[model samples]
Target: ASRLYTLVLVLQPQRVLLGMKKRGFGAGRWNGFGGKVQEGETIEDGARRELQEESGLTVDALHKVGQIVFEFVGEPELMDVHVFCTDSIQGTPVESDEMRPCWFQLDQIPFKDMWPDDSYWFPLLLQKKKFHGYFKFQGQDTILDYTLREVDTV
Candidate 1:
């Protein structure tokens, strides 16, 4: 019941920077840059570090926007994913070994290439509304159930 993850999205006035995962858990999907938080680091710091490794951008400050629990029907433990964003835009996002960095217009985000649950909370992010959510899935593209809530603070 205790696994932690992080995701950091680079937000510009009209676009969002995302990475096409080249390998591992979400290979082939276009998604935000992040990975598991290391035990020796703060969750927020880990988010930024992962961004650097995957996107070639090193953000100074990340704005916490949401936390979502992603569960598989028979996963061994619950996964907590902390979501963050930065308008503070860091270094130029160069393509890295783990990802191919690209920017998409807000309305051009390709949901078909993302995790199924993203469509549920992404609008909240566009509005800068802090939120929390829970999603249970039966398979990679099958969502069993979900609940998303906007919060005053997250």
Candidate 2:
């Protein structure tokens, strides 16, 4: 079975909650909320679970945004990033060991701590635009290749 990742966005002054492991992708840096999809779970269920697990928030009003296939140098599993967005949700954002929820003033995210590809499409996303991307990473330090674009408009 394929693994899935969730990207959650919130708006208390329009902020995005990003995660960071002590040592992993975006470790010590901000990133979209997500984690591995559990067995026997639907994609949306997993997305909802990830939100709670990472930030103590229950996902509501979630709409599928896009999907991306990620291939990295050493990671055993190739991930299918199942992006989701909500116009609204329940609960207050908080920090955790697997993640630390922080509010970024829209258009003011610290993209440098994130993957290089993030800067390319995040602006469109903030505008409620959806996008699909395919990326290949080189040992997690840099992006070896990628393609980023909008979902419906060409």
Candidate 3:
């Protein structure tokens, strides 16, 4: 199966931007924007649509920053995630059902409230350097980790 999703945007100082009822994956934490690749949708469209829907800001430009192959030890299939970055956009971000847009200071990230693995590669994405990562997750915890350079460039 082929599917693509994006963690659409990352803001420094997440604590100020994550909103009310901020529960689940990003609850009260700064995080990227993303969702499922809908049927008949290209990865680009999905990324743009998700960004608009979740953050209410139109993406002016985007570039593939990286990808990750996530697998579970007992599972037979894998989930591939694509990451993107947008430096230009318009409109103030409004809260969506799934995410409430927020910003944070780079050094003051609230890692304690985010998914543990976020601390690993998110910083790498923000750096504009691309890399591929593989994570073996058992529930919410990481069991194994692997990363590669520019597997998508080809």
Candidate 4:
């Protein structure tokens, strides 16, 4: 099976917004707000919806920054995760049942507590570069092998 997902980050001038997942797939980790793409919704729309639902931030615009394919060692499904970024948004980030929102300075990102794949492409996202990545994971925290390349377009 193949699943589609969306992730969006609020990129402020010097800080990036992240959330601590309270439950579900990526629980106990800090990451960008996102989830499964619903039926009849565009990937970009789902990204904005997830951002607002998880953090109370209404994204005014989203720049498609990256695409990553993740395959777990034992999982039968592959996750096609689309990544978006926006510096322009409305409302303040508030905690939801799903996530606790927090902002970190560009230099203070807590990669140790985030998904292993994030540490790879996140830097490209912060650098305002588009990218394509693929990762084969042995587990949630271990990357068996991966490839990441900055691209001309996402």
**Per-candidate local distance difference test:** 0.90, 0.73, 0.67, 0.91
After superposition, candidate 3 runs with Cα above 4 Å error: 10-29, 148-154
What are the per-residue Cα lDDT tens digits for candidate 3 across 85-121? Answer: 7777788879766666667766666677665666777
Candidate 4 ranges beyond 4 A from true positions: none
Question: Can you tell me which runs of candidate 1 are displaced by over 4 Å?
Answer: none
Worst 10 residues of 1 by lDDT: 89-98
RMSD over all Cα atoms, model 1: 0.9
**What TM-score against the true fold does each predicted structure earn?**
0.96, 0.84, 0.79, 0.96
**Candidate with more favorable, higher TM-score: 2 or 4:** 4
**lDDT of the structure predicted as candidate 3:** 0.67
Top of the candidates by lDDT: 4
Q: By TM-score, is 2 or 3 better?
A: 2
lDDT of 3 at 67: 84
How much is 126 displaced in model 4, in angstroms? 1.0
